[PDB]
């Protein structure tokens, strides 16, 4: 189970997640992978800013969806 | 791999092409397409019509190399209101939409009588889940600037394209409340 | 000689096409082109799209032989309202429009919410300085004859094309007054 | 074993091509062609027009080695809406299509009054029963963006190409209702 | 005899290319052409534009052998609304249309003020007397679905093509009625 | 003055007429040539069916004009 | 009579059948040849998903028509 | 200076004049020379019908240029 | 600074002028060169009548701009 | 590391650089080599105007890449 961080420019990174995971988890995993703190990060999926508290399943994100991370 | 899901997509293209108008999924597909081809899809819609536009949108869709394009297409379908096409394509099983094909030809056969009988303003709100959003606000403006005739006819156009599992039932419910005489003319 | 500045154009193209729709500056350009082929460009607009139409306008422009034609191009852009291109081509420096590329791709990836959230009519008056006149006069005709989303959608399309230095800011200004929504979503 | 039907196909050509637009049954014919070369025929449709595009589809039709191509072609015709051409090609007897050639030449001769007299709307619903779908929604997109005559113009264009046994009658029936036009002048 | 008068046609092809859109007189010219070459045109019109389509209509026109074809051409022009042109070819004297070239280059160089200043509808009726029908019902669909600028732009195109003897006068009066604008600009 | 008359079959005849002549004249003249009675004859010019009472000049038919004949 | 089925892999399978057979029968024959269970099988003909209950004669599927096999994956 | 006049028949005739001559005069030279009346004469240059009032220089018609004459039958 | 003037006949002439100059000067130089009297002259830039009293800078005429003379 | 720079004349220059250089630095080297002042210099890579502040690594310029030089024309 995995989905995407697409800086607005060109970089594309692949992350391994679970349906139960919280956006906090994702951004923290992004901190783990790319090193950028969750603070400046804004994740968007289908043109919606994702709030940290909610979960992936709650936002209806399946395998190979692209939330783009943006900053 | 990617090729299998692309050709598996093509295998079904007839249904997709005749159930879908791409401009909505253009709103969604934005980062995956070049602007050239996005506008082309639009120009084919506005010149030749939605079917050829869709068929081209497919033609361009399969060409996508970059990763996740598929679930991109799907999430776009789901999130655009094309849910039930998404459903059927995610499981690769379309039976519902075919049972629809039946009630679809039914409607097309009474379309003139429908067109004349039905007033879109009242019923449209109820079957709003049954159509894409542009389809809904397109037609308010129609019967507003053109007339009730165009509204109903266009209503039929958008309804015939509908991917909703139950829409003939939903339609019957939405009309069977307001008035109606044509309620005796639709059916199970 | 002329080849030098045309070459400066040729290397430096592609900002142009993704920033320009030739039809307006076509209204201006009539005498430098054969009366023919202007229609090729236009037919290309409604066939392939405005961008492909633009790259064709480039193909025709670059071949131009006669005289004084360059300041013709510049004046054409200037007088039609394409500023940042007249500016940028007179100085040959595009950095502004690139920072635009930032906000542009941002919007492109954010497009759907723009579609559902926005009413293209109230805000257009305000950010109209940021758009071309033919442009402005459409939209309203669109969302008048089709719907608020279709209008907004074409609004975005026109926005991505705009060369105006501050347009994301003025846009933010235009919504930060009108209701809110993207005031929390669109940021600088 | 195959050449036989290739030869009979060769014989009944010219009836085929002036009755057929290939890209549609191409949407259907996918496994027998290159995924490419469909585009050749398509580019020929929008470049040369549907007939020459068809004669190219013929050039390609005959050369086909791979299994099932014939009954594949037939199935393509049937499911695409070309039925009645299909009838005549499966039975190798064209009687109807020639009787059509009669009424086809009549329309061709009455074309101007047709253009001016006709409002391609009500009638499209009925002779939508009479036409291929891509064509119909094309007709609409035309008169939506180009005006009523242009639409009608495309309507006559599509009618001359139509293979449906009774289409002149269904036209007449569609016309005698809402009398309003050359219902006198069109007789059968 | 025929070749002599074709040489007469071909001699100044020229004027024709830029004064005529063949599709209308196609509506009329139908029985004299193969459907293939009629279809070639319109693909050329809708791809390359009206002029090249005309020059092609000319190539195919010159190819016409069969008895009476020329007076056919004339009756087509007369009947399509191209009267002011047919006059000139029947007498083989174009002086009027050249005097037009005078006032035409006037517009072509002067287009922008037309673009911004004019509302095409009231005046379309009046110089609807002054234009071909397809043009007339078009420009409406244009300025309706695109807006007043686009309509005006196309109006300019249709005027640049117009063969009517006095059309600049007809326009000047028609504007000297509605508001003013060009009344201070367009005079002779 | 001279004109042409073309049935839909592709066939052809050239008719000798005067500008003042009436469609009855022409239909009967066509009968005189091809044998079809004036009754069954239907002439069309520029997509308009010609009525017996009017004349050629009324319809603006010059030399080498082409009328289309229709049968029954 | 004989029919063709084109798997997504590109292989074309040739089946020997009767007009009286039901899509269920066909799917079972496909299991017999390629081993794929009928549950995951989805057959389409000329852009129509075939219903299990109907028959070849009902669908106007003559000799040498081509069905496309699809799977659930 | 010398120029050309090209009939539809294909025959080509050469006229010797200067830019100062008027198209009426040119037409008249063709009348005096070849016998064609000025009324019936229609001269074209590089795809522009030539006006009687104008002069040769006004149309920028230089030496060894080709005018096309047409007549009305 | 130097700019262009384009007759309908197709001939093209260039005038040497300054941004501060008034159409009187331009019309006068064209008069001096080619002989056209000031009264009948009408110069157009971008589809606008150039006013005699006004100067080049307010109307935004750059170097190598093209005026069309009509009359 | 090595890269290419393409003037409008078509001639190509070969320069030794590092990912760490900022486009201003490269501009300084191009001024140093051919004499064109840094202000007047405009470099393009893959159809993008290159910003003075950022670095080659940000634009992902690997070995033997090609920038097109453009100049500010003129008077």
Swiss-Prot record, chains B, C, D, E:
<feature type="modified residue" description="(Microbial infection) Phosphoserine">
    <location>
        <position position="8"/>
    </location>
</feature>
<protein>
    <recommendedName>
        <fullName>Antiviral innate immune response receptor RIG-I</fullName>
    </recommendedName>
</protein>
<feature type="modified residue" description="Phosphothreonine">
    <location>
        <position position="170"/>
    </location>
</feature>
<feature type="cross-link" description="Glycyl lysine isopeptide (Lys-Gly) (interchain with G-Cter in ubiquitin)">
    <location>
        <position position="181"/>
    </location>
</feature>
<comment type="subunit">
    <text>Monomer; maintained as a monomer in an autoinhibited state. Upon binding of viral RNAs and conformational shift, homooligomerizes and forms filaments on these molecules. Interacts (via tandem CARD domain) with MAVS/IPS1 promoting its filamentation. Interacts with DHX58/LGP2, IKBKE, TBK1 and STING1. Interacts (via CARD domain) with TRIM25 (via SPRY domain). Interacts (double-stranded RNA-bound oligomeric form) with RNF135 (homodimer); involved in RNA length-dependent activation of the RIG-I signaling pathway. Interacts with CYLD.</text>
</comment>
<feature type="cross-link" description="Glycyl lysine isopeptide (Lys-Gly) (interchain with G-Cter in ubiquitin)">
    <location>
        <position position="172"/>
    </location>
</feature>
<feature type="cross-link" description="Glycyl lysine isopeptide (Lys-Gly) (interchain with G-Cter in ubiquitin)">
    <location>
        <position position="48"/>
    </location>
</feature>
<feature type="cross-link" description="Glycyl lysine isopeptide (Lys-Gly) (interchain with G-Cter in ubiquitin)">
    <location>
        <position position="164"/>
    </location>
</feature>
<comment type="similarity">
    <text>Belongs to the helicase family. RLR subfamily.</text>
</comment>
<feature type="domain" description="CARD 2">
    <location>
        <begin position="92"/>
        <end position="172"/>
    </location>
</feature>
<feature type="cross-link" description="Glycyl lysine isopeptide (Lys-Gly) (interchain with G-Cter in ubiquitin)">
    <location>
        <position position="154"/>
    </location>
</feature>
<comment type="function">
    <text>Innate immune receptor that senses cytoplasmic viral nucleic acids and activates a downstream signaling cascade leading to the production of type I interferons and pro-inflammatory cytokines. Forms a ribonucleoprotein complex with viral RNAs on which it homooligomerizes to form filaments. The homooligomerization allows the recruitment of RNF135 an E3 ubiquitin-protein ligase that activates and amplifies the RIG-I-mediated antiviral signaling in an RNA length-dependent manner through ubiquitination-dependent and -independent mechanisms.</text>
</comment>
<feature type="modified residue" description="Phosphoserine">
    <location>
        <position position="8"/>
    </location>
</feature>
<feature type="domain" description="CARD 1">
    <location>
        <begin position="1"/>
        <end position="87"/>
    </location>
</feature>
<comment type="subunit">
    <text>(Microbial infection) Interacts with protein Z of Guanarito virus, Machupo virus, Junin arenavirus and Sabia virus. This interaction disrupts its interaction with MAVS/IPS1, impeding downstream IRF3 and NF-kappa-B activation and resulting in decreased IFN-beta induction.</text>
</comment>
<feature type="cross-link" description="Glycyl lysine isopeptide (Lys-Gly) (interchain with G-Cter in ubiquitin)">
    <location>
        <position position="96"/>
    </location>
</feature>
Curated annotation (Swiss-Prot), chain J:
<protein>
    <recommendedName>
        <fullName>Ubiquitin</fullName>
    </recommendedName>
</protein>
<comment type="function">
    <text>Exists either covalently attached to another protein, or free (unanchored). When covalently bound, it is conjugated to target proteins via an isopeptide bond either as a monomer (monoubiquitin), a polymer linked via different Lys residues of the ubiquitin (polyubiquitin chains) or a linear polymer linked via the initiator Met of the ubiquitin (linear polyubiquitin chains).</text>
</comment>
<feature type="domain" description="Ubiquitin-like 2">
    <location>
        <begin position="1"/>
        <end position="75"/>
    </location>
</feature>
């Amino acid at each position: 189970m995995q989905i995407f961080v697409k800086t607005l420019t060109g970089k594309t990174i692949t992350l391994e997640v679970e349906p139960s995971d919280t956006i906090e988890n994702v951004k923290a995993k992004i901190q783990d992978k790319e090193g950028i703190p969750p603070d400046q990060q804004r994740l968007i999926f289908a043109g919606k800013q994702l709030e940290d508290g909610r979960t992936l399943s709650d936002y209806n994100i399946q395998k190979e969806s692209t939330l783009h991370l943006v900053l | 791999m990617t090729t299998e899901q692309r050709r598996s997509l093509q295998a079904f293209q007839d249904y997709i092409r005749k159930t879908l108008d791409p401009t909505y999924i253009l709103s969604y597909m934005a980062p995956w397409f070049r602007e050239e081809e996005v506008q082309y899809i639009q120009a084919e819609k506005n010149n030749k019509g939605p079917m050829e536009a869709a068929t081209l949108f497919l033609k361009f869709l399969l060409e996508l190399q970059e990763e996740g394009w598929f679930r991109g297409f799907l999430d776009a379908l789901d999130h655009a209101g094309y849910s039930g096409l998404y459903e059927a394509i995610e499981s690769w099983d379309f039976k519902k939409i075919e049972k629809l094909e039946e009630y679809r030809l039914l409607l097309k056969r009474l379309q003139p009588e429908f067109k004349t009988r039905i007033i879109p303003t009242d019923i449209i709100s109820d079957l709003s889940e049954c159509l894409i959003n542009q389809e809904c606000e397109e037609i308010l403006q129609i019967c507003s600037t053109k007339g009730m005739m165009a509204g109903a006819e266009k209503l039929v156009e958008c309804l015939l394209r509908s991917d909703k599992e139950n829409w003939p039932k939903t339609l019957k419910l939405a009309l069977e409340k307001e008035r109606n005489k044509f309620s005796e003319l639709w059916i199970v």
